[PDB]
XYZ file of C-alpha atoms in Angstrom:
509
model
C 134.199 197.493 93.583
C 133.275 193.786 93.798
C 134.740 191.578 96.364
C 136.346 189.585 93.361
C 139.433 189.861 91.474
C 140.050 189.535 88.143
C 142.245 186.262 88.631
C 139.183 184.669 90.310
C 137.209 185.681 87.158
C 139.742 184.296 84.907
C 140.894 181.465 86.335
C 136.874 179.868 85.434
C 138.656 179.711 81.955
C 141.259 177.241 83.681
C 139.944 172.998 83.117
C 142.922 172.255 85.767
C 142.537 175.307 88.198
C 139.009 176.790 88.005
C 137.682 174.472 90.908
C 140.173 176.168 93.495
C 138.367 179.752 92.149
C 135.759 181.387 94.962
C 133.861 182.108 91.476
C 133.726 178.602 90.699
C 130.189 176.999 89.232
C 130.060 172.870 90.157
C 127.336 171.020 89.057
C 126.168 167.344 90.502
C 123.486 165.573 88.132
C 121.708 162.590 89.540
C 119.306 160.022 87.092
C 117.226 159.061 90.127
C 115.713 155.493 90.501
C 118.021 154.827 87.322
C 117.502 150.826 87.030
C 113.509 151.485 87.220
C 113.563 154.350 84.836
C 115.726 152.365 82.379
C 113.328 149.704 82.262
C 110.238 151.897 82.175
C 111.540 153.568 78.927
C 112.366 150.081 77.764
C 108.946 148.808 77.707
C 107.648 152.368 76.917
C 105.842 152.857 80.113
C 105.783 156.524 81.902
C 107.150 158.202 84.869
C 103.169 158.429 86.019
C 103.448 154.654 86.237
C 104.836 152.535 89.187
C 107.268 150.477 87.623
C 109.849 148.966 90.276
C 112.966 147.384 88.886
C 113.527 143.677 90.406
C 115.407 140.325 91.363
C 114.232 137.414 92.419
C 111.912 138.169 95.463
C 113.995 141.557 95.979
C 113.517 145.337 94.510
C 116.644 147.087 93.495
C 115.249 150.577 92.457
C 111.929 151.802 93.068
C 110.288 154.727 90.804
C 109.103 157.833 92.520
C 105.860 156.933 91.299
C 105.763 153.772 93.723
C 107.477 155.417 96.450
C 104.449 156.835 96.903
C 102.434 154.053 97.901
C 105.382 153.648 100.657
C 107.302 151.203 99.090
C 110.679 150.554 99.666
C 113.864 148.624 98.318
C 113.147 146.470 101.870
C 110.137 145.610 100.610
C 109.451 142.269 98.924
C 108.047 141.736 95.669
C 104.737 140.507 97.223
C 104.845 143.019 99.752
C 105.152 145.562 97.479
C 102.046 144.051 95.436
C 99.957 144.775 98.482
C 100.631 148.458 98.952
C 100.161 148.826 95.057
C 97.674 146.665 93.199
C 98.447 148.145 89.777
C 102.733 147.801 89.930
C 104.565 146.474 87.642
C 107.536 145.292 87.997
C 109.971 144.471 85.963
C 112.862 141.965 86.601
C 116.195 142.533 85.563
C 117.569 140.667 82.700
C 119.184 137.537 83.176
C 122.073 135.442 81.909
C 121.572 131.394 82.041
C 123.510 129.180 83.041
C 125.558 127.818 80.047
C 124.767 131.137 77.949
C 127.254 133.888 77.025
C 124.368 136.767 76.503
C 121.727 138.240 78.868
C 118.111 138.381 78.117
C 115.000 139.852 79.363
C 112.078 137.579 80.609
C 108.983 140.071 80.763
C 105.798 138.440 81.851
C 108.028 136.133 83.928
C 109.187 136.311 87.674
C 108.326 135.125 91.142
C 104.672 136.767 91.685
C 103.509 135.316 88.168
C 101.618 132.211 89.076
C 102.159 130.300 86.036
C 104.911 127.611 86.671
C 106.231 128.316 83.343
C 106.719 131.348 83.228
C 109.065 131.963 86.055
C 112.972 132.916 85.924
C 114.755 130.353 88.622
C 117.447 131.495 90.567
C 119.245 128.492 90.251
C 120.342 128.309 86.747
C 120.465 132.195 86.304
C 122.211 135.413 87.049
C 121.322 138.650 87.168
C 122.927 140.890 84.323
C 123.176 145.066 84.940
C 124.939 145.269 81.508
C 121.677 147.011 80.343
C 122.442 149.376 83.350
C 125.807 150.370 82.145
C 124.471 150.480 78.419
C 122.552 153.431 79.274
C 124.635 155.220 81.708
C 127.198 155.629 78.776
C 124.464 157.181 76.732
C 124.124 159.784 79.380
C 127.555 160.591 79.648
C 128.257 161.152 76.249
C 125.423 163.399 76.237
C 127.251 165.016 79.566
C 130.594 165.289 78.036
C 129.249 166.857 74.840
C 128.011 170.042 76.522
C 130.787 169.966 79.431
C 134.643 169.900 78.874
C 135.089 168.132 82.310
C 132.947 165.377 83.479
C 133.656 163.348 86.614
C 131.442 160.294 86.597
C 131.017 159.906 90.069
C 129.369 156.429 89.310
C 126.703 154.923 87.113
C 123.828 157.443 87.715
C 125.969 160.373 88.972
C 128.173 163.025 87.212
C 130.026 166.487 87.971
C 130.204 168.827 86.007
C 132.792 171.861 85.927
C 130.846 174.690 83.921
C 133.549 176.826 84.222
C 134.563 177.263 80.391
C 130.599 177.340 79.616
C 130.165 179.905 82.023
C 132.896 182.345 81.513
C 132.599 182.372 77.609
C 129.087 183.193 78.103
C 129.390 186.154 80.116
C 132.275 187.105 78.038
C 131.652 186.336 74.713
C 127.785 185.222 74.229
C 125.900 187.521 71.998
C 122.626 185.781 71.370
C 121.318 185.230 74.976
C 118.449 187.283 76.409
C 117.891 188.578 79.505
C 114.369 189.922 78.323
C 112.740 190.848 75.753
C 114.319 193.952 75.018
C 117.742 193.346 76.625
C 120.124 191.281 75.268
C 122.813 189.656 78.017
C 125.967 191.318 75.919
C 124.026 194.959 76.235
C 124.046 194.325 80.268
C 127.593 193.279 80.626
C 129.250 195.894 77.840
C 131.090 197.472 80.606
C 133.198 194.165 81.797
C 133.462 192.936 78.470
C 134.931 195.861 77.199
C 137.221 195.812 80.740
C 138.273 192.182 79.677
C 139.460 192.915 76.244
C 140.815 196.203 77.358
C 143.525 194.322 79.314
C 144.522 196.996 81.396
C 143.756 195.534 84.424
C 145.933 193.867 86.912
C 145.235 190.217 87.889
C 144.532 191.004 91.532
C 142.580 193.878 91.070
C 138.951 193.773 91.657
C 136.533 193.884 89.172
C 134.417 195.884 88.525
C 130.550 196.322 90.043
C 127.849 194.523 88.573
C 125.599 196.485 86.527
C 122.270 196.526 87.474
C 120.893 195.548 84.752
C 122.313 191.721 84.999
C 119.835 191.393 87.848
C 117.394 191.076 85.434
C 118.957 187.426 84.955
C 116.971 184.618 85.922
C 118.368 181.678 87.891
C 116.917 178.378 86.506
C 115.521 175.910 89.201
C 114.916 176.812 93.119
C 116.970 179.253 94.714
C 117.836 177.727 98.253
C 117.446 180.944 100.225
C 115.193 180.555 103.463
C 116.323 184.008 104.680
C 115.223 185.967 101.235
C 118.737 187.406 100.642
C 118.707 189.396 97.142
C 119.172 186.891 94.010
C 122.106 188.675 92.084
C 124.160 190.594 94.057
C 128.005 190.341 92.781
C 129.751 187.816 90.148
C 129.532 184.822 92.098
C 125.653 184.882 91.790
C 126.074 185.782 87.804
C 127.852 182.978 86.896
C 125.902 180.624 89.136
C 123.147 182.073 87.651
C 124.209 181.335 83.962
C 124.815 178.063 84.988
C 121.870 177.114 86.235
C 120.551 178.095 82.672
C 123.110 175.695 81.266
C 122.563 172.833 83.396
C 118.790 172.756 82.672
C 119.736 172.762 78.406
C 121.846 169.740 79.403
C 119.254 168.127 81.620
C 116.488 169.041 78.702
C 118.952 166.882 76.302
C 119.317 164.031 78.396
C 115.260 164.260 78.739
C 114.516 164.417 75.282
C 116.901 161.896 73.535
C 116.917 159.184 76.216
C 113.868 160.171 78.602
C 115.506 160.118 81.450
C 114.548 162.471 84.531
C 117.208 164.074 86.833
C 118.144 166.398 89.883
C 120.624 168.625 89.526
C 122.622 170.317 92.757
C 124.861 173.732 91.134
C 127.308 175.582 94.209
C 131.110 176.548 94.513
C 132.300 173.064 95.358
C 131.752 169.364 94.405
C 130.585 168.692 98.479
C 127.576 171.485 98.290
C 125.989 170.733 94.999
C 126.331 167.154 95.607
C 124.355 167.506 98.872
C 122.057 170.269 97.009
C 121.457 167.352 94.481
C 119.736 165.469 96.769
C 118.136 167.731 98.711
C 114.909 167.519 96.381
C 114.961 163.951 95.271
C 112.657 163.636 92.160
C 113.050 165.898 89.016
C 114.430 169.122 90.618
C 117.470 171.484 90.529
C 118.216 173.460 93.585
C 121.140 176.377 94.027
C 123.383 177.241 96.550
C 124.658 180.876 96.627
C 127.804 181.495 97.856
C 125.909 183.982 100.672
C 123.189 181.224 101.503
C 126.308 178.466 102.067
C 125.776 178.677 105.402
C 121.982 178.828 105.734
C 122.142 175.442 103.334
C 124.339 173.587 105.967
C 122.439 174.791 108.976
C 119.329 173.906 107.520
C 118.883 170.979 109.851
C 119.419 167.910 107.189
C 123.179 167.966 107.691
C 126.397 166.731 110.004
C 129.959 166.406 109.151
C 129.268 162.916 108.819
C 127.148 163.908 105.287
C 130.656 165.274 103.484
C 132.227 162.894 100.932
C 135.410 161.707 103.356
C 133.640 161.512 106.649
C 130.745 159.149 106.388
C 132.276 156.653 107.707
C 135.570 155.671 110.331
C 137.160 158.700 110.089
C 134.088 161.086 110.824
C 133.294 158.756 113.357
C 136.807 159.611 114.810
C 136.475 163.538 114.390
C 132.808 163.193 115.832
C 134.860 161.643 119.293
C 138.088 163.850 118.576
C 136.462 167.015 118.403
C 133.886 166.783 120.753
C 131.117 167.347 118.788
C 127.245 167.633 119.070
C 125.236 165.082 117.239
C 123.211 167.682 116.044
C 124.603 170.578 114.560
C 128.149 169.174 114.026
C 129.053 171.832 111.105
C 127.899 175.417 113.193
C 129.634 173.776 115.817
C 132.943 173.003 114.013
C 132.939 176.487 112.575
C 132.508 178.722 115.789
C 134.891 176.861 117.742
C 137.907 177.994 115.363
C 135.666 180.827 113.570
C 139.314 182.568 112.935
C 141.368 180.295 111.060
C 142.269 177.126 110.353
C 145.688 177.026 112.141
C 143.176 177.196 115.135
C 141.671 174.159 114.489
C 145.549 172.583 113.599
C 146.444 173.892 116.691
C 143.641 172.034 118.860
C 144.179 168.888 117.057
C 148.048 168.850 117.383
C 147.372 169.223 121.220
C 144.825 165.833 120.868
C 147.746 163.754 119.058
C 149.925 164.528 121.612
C 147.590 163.321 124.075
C 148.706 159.842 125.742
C 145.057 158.568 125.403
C 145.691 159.192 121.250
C 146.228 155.509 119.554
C 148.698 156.523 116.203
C 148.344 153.124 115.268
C 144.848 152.404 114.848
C 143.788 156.095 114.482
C 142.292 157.589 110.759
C 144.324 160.723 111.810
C 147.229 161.456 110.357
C 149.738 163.145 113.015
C 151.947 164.742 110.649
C 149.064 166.605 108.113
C 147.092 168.420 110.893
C 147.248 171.317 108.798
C 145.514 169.414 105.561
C 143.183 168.432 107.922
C 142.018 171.662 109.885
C 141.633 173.103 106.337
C 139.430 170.926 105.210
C 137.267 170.908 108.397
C 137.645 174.750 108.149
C 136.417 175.124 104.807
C 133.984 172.370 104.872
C 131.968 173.448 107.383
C 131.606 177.013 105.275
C 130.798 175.437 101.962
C 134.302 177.081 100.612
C 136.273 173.497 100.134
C 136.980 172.914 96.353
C 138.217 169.476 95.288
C 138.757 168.865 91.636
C 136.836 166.376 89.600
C 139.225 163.557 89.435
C 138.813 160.550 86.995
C 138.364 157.679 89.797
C 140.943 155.239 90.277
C 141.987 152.505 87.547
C 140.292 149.177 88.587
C 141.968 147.265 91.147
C 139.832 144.049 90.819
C 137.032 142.791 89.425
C 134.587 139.803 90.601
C 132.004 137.669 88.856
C 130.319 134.783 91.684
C 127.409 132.345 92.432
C 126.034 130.970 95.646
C 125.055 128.116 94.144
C 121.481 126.238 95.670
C 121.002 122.876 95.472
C 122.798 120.790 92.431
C 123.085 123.808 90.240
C 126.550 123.177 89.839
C 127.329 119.440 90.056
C 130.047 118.639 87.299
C 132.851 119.940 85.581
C 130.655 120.543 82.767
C 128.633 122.527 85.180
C 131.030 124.407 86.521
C 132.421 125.478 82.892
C 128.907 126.019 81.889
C 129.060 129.078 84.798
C 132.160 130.309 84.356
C 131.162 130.826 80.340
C 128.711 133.171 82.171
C 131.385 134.436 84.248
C 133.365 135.422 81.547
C 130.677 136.846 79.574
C 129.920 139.216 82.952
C 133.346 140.487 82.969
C 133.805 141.133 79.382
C 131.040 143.529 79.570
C 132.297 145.183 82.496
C 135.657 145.485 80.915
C 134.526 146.600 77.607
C 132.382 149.061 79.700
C 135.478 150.864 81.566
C 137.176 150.936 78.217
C 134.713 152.727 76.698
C 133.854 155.174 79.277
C 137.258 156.069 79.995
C 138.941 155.646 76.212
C 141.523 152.821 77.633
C 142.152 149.469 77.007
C 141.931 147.151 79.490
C 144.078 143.884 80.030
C 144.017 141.642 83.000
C 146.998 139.609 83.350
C 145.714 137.187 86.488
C 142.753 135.440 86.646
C 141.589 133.649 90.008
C 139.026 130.748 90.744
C 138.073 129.764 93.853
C 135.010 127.992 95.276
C 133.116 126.365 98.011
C 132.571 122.528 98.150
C 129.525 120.624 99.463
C 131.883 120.041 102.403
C 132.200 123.798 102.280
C 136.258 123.100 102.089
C 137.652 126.436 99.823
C 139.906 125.454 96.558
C 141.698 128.332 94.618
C 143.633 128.521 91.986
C 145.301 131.530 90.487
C 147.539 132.157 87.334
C 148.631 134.300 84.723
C 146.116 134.837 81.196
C 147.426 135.546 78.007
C 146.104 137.725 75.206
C 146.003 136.098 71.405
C 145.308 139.369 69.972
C 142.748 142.302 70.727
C 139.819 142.549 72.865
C 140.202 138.189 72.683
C 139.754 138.630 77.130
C 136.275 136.123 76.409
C 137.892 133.439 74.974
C 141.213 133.404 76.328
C 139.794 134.326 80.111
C 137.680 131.432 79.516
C 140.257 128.870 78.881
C 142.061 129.752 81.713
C 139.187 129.445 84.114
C 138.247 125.743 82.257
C 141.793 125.068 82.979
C 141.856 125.757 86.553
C 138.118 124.543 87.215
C 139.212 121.294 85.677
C 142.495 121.166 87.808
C 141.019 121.810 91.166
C 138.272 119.003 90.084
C 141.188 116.441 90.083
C 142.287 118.035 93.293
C 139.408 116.708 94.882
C 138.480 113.877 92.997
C 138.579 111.551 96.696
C 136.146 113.929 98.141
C 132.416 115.345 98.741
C 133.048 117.947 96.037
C 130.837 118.303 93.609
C 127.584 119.907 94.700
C 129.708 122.979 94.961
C 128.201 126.095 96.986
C 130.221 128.850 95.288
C 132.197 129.627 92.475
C 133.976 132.663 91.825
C 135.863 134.057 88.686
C 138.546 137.308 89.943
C 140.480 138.927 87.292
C 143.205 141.120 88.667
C 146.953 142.624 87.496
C 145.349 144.943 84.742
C 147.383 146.745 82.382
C 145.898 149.670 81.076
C 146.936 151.024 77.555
């Protein structure tokens, strides 16, 4: 019999519990080089041609297709010129100072020698509205074929195929294996087991027939020590949703033209580093049996997981003595038994008079979350659920300001109608991509005099009516920026250095 119970089987079926299932199928899809891609299928260039995405002297996103002439988001514009002499790049749109609306400039920027046709960095800001624009196309494309979608970020999703995957094996009729075998002729015998019923949850299920090894996995099959492809459920359902993932990739392809790479495991941590394992257009699998052989394949530490890339891992690095290469082998054949060995080993280090509770990441009193997670991370087996990421805390829209950019109160209302603009956009954005409405309640303006002495000046916004944030954010802000202008009306003030608009207390309905 399999090594799999029926409840693992089933619980795929489960939006709120099939993550915590050893059957699970996690998918991590990645729109690579994003900014430069969106602006190459703007001006209806290809992915053959080195577009790079930029600002001011600086790149932001290079395409794969430039990479290859070695260049680099520390590269300058110019520099970059030199190790291409066909690139073309493509600066970001812009909002100007005064405006409440971004606009693109092609044929202008810093490495075009005509005078007039250049896009100063004093009067204008750089706008990634077009950015987020796109990214919601993508994830409505996402969450049509997927019941759960974590966006991860603006060129990043999950996916849990779980639903996808268990009705096909169950229930799908149509799909072929070959051409004489259909995929409901190979599975008959746990089909007819699953309707049956009579089968208790924690029994195991049954063995796979061999005729589902005639499934083909989509993409490339991480497996450096040529272990057999299908060998129990866990590879069948991986297997189907490989085939899944590359219909979704296909649709994001072919109605927005977008290229991805695609990392499908067990657990949000493996596919996400399976995701970018193969950088350009590629999807790679993880097998539950080739978990190991994946982490140990040299590109990896502890530090890589999702929690521990920065203070904390740092910590554990110290903490747990670890090698700098080979962190993850090592954490798992020091406590290969359980995790209480590991909780055990780091109770005895808390209690150690060298231990500093008070500036430590460690927790004392959850050792035993803790061991787990080192326990199961370091064997590909730790599930996390995709989570909706937290409601916004804050949001920012500021200006160095050079020279006299901003030397009036009619200057300084002239930015902060750009301001405004910038945050609309990014609220309008979270409502949208999250079906909520957004309200801030405080708004804060501070800024930097030619003295370089800081005024701020916070207070409470109202709301007229609907999505009215512009306008009544805006009056707000004129109000303040008018009020800390009298402040310092006996003062070097006005060629101002910074100016900052920060909305925060949001109410989310």
């Amino acid at each position: 019999m399999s090594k799999f119970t029926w409840k693992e089987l089933i619980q795929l079926g489960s939006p709120s519990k099939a993550y915590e299932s050893s059957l699970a199928c996690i998918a991590h899809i990645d729109m690579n080089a994003f900014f430069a891609q969106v602006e190459q299928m703007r001006c209806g260039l290809s992915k053959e041609d080195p577009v790079v995405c930029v600002q001011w002297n600086s790149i932001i996103a290079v395409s794969y297709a430039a990479r290859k002439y070695g260049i680099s988001r520390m590269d300058t514009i110019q520099e970059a010129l030199k190790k291409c002499s066909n690139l073309i790049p493509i600066h970001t749109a812009v909002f100007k100072k005064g405006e409440d609306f971004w606009q693109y400039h092609d044929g202008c920027g810093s490495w075009v020698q005509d005078p007039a046709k250049q896009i100063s960095v004093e009067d204008h800001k750089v706008s990634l509205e077009p950015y987020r624009r796109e990214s919601r196309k993508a994830l409505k494309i996402f969450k049509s074929a997927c019941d759960l979608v974590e966006r991860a970020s603006i060129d990043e999703v999950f996916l849990d195929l779980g639903r996808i995957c268990f009705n096909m094996l169950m229930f799908d009729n149509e799909y072929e294996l070959t051409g004489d075998l259909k995929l409901k002729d190979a599975l008959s015998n746990i089909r007819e087991a699953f309707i049956g019923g009579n089968y208790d949850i924690n029994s195991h299920l049954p063995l796979i027939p061999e005729k589902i090894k005639s499934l083909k996995f989509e993409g490339d099959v991480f497996n450096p020590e040529g272990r057999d492809l299908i060998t129990d459920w866990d590879d069948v359902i991986l297997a189907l949703g490989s085939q899944v993932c590359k219909g979704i990739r296909d649709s994001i392809k072919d109605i927005l033209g977008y290229t991805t790479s695609c990392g499908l495991s067990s657990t949000k941590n493996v596919c996400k580093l399976a995701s970018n394992y193969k950088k350009p257009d590629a999807q790679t699998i993880v097998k539950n049996d080739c978990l190991l052989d994946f982490l140990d394949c040299g590109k990896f530490e502890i530090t890589s997981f999702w929690t521990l890339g920065g203070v904390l891992g740092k910590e554990l690095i110290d903490v747990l003595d670890l090698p700098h290469e080979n962190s993850i082998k090592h954490i798992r054949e020091t406590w290969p038994d359980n995790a209480g060995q590991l909780k055990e080993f780091l109770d005895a280090k808390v209690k150690q008079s060298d231990y500093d509770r008070s500036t430590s990441n460690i927790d004392p009193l959850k050792t035993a979350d803790l061991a787990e997670k080192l326990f199961k991370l370091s064997r590909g087996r730790y599930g996390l659920p995709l989570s909706s990421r937290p409601v916004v805390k804050s949001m920012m829209s500021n200006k160095n300001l050079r020279g006299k950019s901003c030397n009036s109160i009619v200057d300084c209302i002239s930015w902060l109608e750009v301001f405004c603009a910038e945050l609309t956009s990014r609220i309008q954005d979270l409502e949208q991509e999250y079906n909520k409405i957004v309200i801030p309640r405080t708004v804060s303006i501070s800024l930097k005099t030619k003295s370089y002495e800081v005024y701020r000046k916070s207070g409470p916004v109202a709301y007229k009516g609907i999505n009215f944030q512009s306008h009544e954010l805006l009056k707000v802000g004129i109000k303040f920026v008018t009020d800390l202008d009298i402040k310092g009306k006996n003062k070097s003030y006005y060629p101002l250095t910074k100016l900052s608009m920060t909305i925060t207390n949001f109410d989310i309905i």
